[PDB]
Amino acid sequence: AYTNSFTRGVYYPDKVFRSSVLHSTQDLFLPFFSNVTWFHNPVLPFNDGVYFASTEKSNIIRGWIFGTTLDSKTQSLLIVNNATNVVIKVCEFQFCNDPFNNCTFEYVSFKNLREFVFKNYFKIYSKHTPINDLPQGFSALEPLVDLPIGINITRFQTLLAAYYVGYLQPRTFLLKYNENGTITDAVDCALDPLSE
Amino acid sequence: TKCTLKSFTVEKGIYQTSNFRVQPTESIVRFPNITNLCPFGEVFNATRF
Amino acid sequence: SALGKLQDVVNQNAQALNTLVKQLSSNFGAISSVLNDILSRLDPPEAEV
Amino acid sequence: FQPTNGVGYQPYRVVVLSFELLHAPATVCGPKKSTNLVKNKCVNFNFNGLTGTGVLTESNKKFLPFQQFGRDIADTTDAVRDPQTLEILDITPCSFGGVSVITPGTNTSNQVAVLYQDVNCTEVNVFQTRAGCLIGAEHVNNSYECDIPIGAGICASYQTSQSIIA
Numbered sequence: 012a013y014t015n016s017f018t019r020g021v022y023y024p025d026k027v028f029r030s031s032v033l034h035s036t037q038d039l040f041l042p043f044f045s046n047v048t049w050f051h052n053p054v055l056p057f058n059d060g061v062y063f064a065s066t067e068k069s070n071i072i073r074g075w076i077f078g079t080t081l082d083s084k085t086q087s088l089l090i091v092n093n094a095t096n097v098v099i100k101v102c103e104f105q106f107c108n109d110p111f112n113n114c115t116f117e118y119v120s121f122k123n124l125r126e127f128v129f130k131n132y133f134k135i136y137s138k139h140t141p142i143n144d145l146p147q148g149f150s151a152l153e154p155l156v157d158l159p160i161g162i163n164i165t166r167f168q169t170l171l172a173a174y175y176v177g178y179l180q181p182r183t184f185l186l187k188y189n190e191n192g193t194i195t196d197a198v199d200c201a202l203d204p205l206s207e
Numbered sequence: 208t209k210c211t212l213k214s215f216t217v218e219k220g221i222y223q224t225s226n227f228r229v230q231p232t233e234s235i236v237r238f239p240n241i242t243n244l245c246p247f248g249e250v251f252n253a254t255r256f
Numbered sequence: 257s258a259l260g261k262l263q264d265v266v267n268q269n270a271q272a273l274n275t276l277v278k279q280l281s282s283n284f285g286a287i288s289s290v291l292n293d294i295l296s297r298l299d300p301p302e303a304e305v
Numbered sequence: 306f307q308p309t310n311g312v313g314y315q316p317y318r319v320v321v322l323s324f325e326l327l328h329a330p331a332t333v334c335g336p337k338k339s340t341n342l343v344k345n346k347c348v349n350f351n352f353n354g355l356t357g358t359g360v361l362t363e364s365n366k367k368f369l370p371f372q373q374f375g376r377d378i379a380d381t382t383d384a385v386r387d388p389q390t391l392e393i394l395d396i397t398p399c400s401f402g403g404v405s406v407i408t409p410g411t412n413t414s415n416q417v418a419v420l421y422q423d424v425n426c427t428e429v430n431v432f433q434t435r436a437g438c439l440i441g442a443e444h445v446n447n448s449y450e451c452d453i454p455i456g457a458g459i460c461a462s463y464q465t466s467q468s469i470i471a
């Protein structure tokens with residue numbers, strides 16, 4: 012199953028504030044009108060990034076799992092929401108093939124679109140938009156977390172509605188900061204002659 | 208003026224000589240309120256060694 | 257669109273100034289584009305080069 | 306361990322700290338001194354990451370909750386969020402500019418008048434023109450042909466005991 016990532020996947024690449032200026036930055040973005048893998052369970056690669064999304068109703072999607080060997084041999088990050096708080100751990104677990112040691116780190120605190128971006132240390136961007144089949148349109152992503160865990164990742168999985176998995180690429184864009192400093196529109200600088 | 212013109216007489220006019228520049232009076236340093244300290248009270252003031 | 261000639265003079269000078277300024281952010285084969293940064297990080301003999 | 310021994314056999318508690326450095330971004334760092342905040346003076350600031358010299362003034366720009374800097378159309382730092390109390394300050398580079406020396410010919414008199422270019426004339430009998438800070442020339446209400454050009458329509462001349470008028 013597949014679908015077409017129309018216009019989504021744009022995140023404030025840094026922390027500066029710009030007003031009404033058209034900036035031009037080169038980084039890892041999700042190419043426009045790309046191919047998203049429609050899902051509704053297994054592991055997936057981690058080439059250089061992810062555009063994890065979701066169109067959820069009753070929070071079926073709970074959390075993630077990362078790591079190289081995905082079990083006890085290396086460390087493997089684990090983000091989980093067990094209806095209390097987002098209990099992040101980095102303990103080198105022994106995992107189960109159907110879920111739903113030294114810990115160098117820890118923490119404990121269709122109408123939902125929870126867009127997410129992950130990349131490498133570890134950074135996360137998110138956006139939680141009301142919705143009502145991937146809706147076209149535009150929405151930037153605010154950077155909500157950075158984690159200095161130095162883990163080595165090459166694959167990931169999902170805990171347990173539908174979700175979608177992009178894959179970032181090193182492509183130059185053109186961002187339109189509005190007067191409030193809010194990205195309102197972008198132009199993929201290599202999509203087609205008009206865009207070039 | 209006499210020195211920049213390399214002359215001992217300067218005919219009437221308006222010449223540019225030097226470069227006015229305020230100097231930075233004092234340095235300043237700012238960092239977020241330091242918190243999240245290490246628990247050395249648990250290593251040194253421990254009940255049993 | 258009749259006043260393109262004057263608009264052209266203004267635009268040309270603006271672009272020249274903007275390129276001149278943006279040349280400040282280039283390394284030209286050195287370590288860092290900031291001067292004090294090299295003065296602090298690299299030793300004076302290396303900072304000279 | 307008997308309490309009546311000497312200090313030679315008396316118990317001692319020992320704690321050994323091993324500072325390991327592997328190629329990781331060094332999470333365990335110490336405290337950083339944060340001086341008081343001064344405004345409206347050409348100061349040499351160093352906010353948490355970035356440095357530079359300026360004149361900090363209370364602004365009215367509205368950053369986003371997570372943004373820290375502000376930049377200009379030419380990619381220059383212009384506004385910094387105070388990382389202790391979240392108030393956004395501007396950054397104005399403290400004034401510089403050329404210095405001109407208006408003069409009648411030395412064949413006439415040894416009197417001159419200085420013109421500091423583009424200053425508020427309070428950062429140095431003292432006239433403030435649309436060109437800069439004129440120092441040493443009377444301000445007449447008259448209007449004569451331009452003898453020595455200055456700028457923005459101002460012209461100075463040596464006239465009547467005599468002096469320099471603008």
Ligand SMILES: *[C@@H]1O[C@H](CO)[C@@H](O)[C@H](O)[C@H]1NC(C)=O
Pocket residue numbers: 013044045046
């Ligand atoms: C990839 O995208 C193309 C058009 O962009 C589409 O025709 C195709 O079905 C998508 N999936 C695969 C596996 O090619």
Ligand SMILES: *[C@@H]1O[C@H](CO)[C@@H](O)[C@H](O)[C@H]1NC(C)=O
Pocket residue numbers: 093094095096098119
């Ligand atoms: C979620 O997990 C954490 C860690 O195991 C635990 O402290 C917390 O009680 C859990 N919450 C619930 C609702 O079970």
Ligand SMILES: *[C@@H]1O[C@H](CO)[C@@H](O)[C@H](O)[C@H]1NC(C)=O
Pocket residue numbers: 079163164165
């Ligand atoms: C992570 O693993 C890859 C191979 O899977 C290796 O090339 C890379 O050097 C490793 N990096 C770290 C920091 O362990």
Ligand SMILES: *[C@@H]1O[C@H](CO)[C@@H](O)[C@H](O)[C@H]1NC(C)=O
Pocket residue numbers: 189190191
């Ligand atoms: C910018 O922010 C202000 C602050 O309330 C808001 O009223 C306005 O709608 C926003 N957008 C524009 C284009 O001004």
Ligand SMILES: *[C@@H]1O[C@H](CO)[C@@H](O)[C@H](O)[C@H]1NC(C)=O
Pocket residue numbers: 412413
């Ligand atoms: C200019 O200098 C000469 C001397 O070389 C003198 O004779 C003459 O009177 C002077 N003229 C004025 C207007 O000062």
Ligand SMILES: *[C@@H]1O[C@H](CO)[C@@H](O)[C@H](O)[C@H]1NC(C)=O
Pocket residue numbers: 425427
């Ligand atoms: C010069 O500075 C004073 C005091 O800071 C101020 O009141 C005055 O308006 C300034 N002049 C101009 C032309 O801005």
